[PDB]
Amino acid sequence: MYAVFQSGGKQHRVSEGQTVRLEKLDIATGETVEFAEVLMIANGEEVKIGVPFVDGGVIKAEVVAHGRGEKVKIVKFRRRKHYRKQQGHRQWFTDVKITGISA
């Protein structure tokens, strides 16, 4: 029981009952979200996609976090060219818990 699906430009493989961190979504922190673009579903038997996004497979998740990642410092430094540049980054992350998997 594990499903592979494309959510935010990258494909995630998740098993039932776990949580996944992905790109930010326009969904409330306490809202249910649906993923019908399920690229693959696997169980004791194997079902594969002849066409992307299966036919009826769907993943239901519940949003838990709408946070920001750990601080990453970008520093550019040019040797003997008199240049140092500093920048900070905290990529937004959405953490969800996969509550349901269809067939």
Partner 1 sequence: ARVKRGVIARARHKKILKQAKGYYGARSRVYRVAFQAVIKAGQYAYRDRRQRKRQFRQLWIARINAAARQNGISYSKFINGLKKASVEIDRKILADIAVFDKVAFTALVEKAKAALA
Partner 2 sequence: MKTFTAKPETVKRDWYVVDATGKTLGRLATELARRLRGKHKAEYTPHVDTGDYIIVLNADKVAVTGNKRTDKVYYHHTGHIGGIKQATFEEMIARRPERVIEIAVKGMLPKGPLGRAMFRKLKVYAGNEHNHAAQQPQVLDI
Partner RNA sequence: CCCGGCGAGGGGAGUGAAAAAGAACCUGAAACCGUGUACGUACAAGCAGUGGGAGCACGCUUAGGCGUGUGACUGCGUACC
Partner RNA sequence: GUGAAGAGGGAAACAACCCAGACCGCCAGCUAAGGUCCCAAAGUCAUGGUUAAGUGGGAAACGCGGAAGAUGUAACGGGGCUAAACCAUGCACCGAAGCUGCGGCAGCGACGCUUAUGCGUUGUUGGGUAGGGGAGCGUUCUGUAAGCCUGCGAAGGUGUGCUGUGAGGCAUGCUGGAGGUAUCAGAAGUGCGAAUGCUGACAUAAGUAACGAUAAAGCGGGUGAAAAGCCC
Partner RNA sequence: UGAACUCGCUGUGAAGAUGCAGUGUACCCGCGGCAAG
- Contact call for residue 71 and RNA (CB under 7 A): yes
Q: Which of 95, 98, 97 minimizes the C-alpha distance to 68?
A: 95
Phi, psi of 26 (to 5 degrees): -85, 55
Site string for RNA, 13-52 (x = CB under 7 A): ----------xx----------------------------
| CA dihedral angle for residue 11, residue 15, residue 17, residue 21, rounded to 10 degrees | -30
Q: Min. distance of Cβ 55 from partner 2 in angstroms? A: 26
Tell me which residues touch RNA (CB under 7 A): 8-10, 23-24, 68, 71-72, 74, 78-83, 85-92
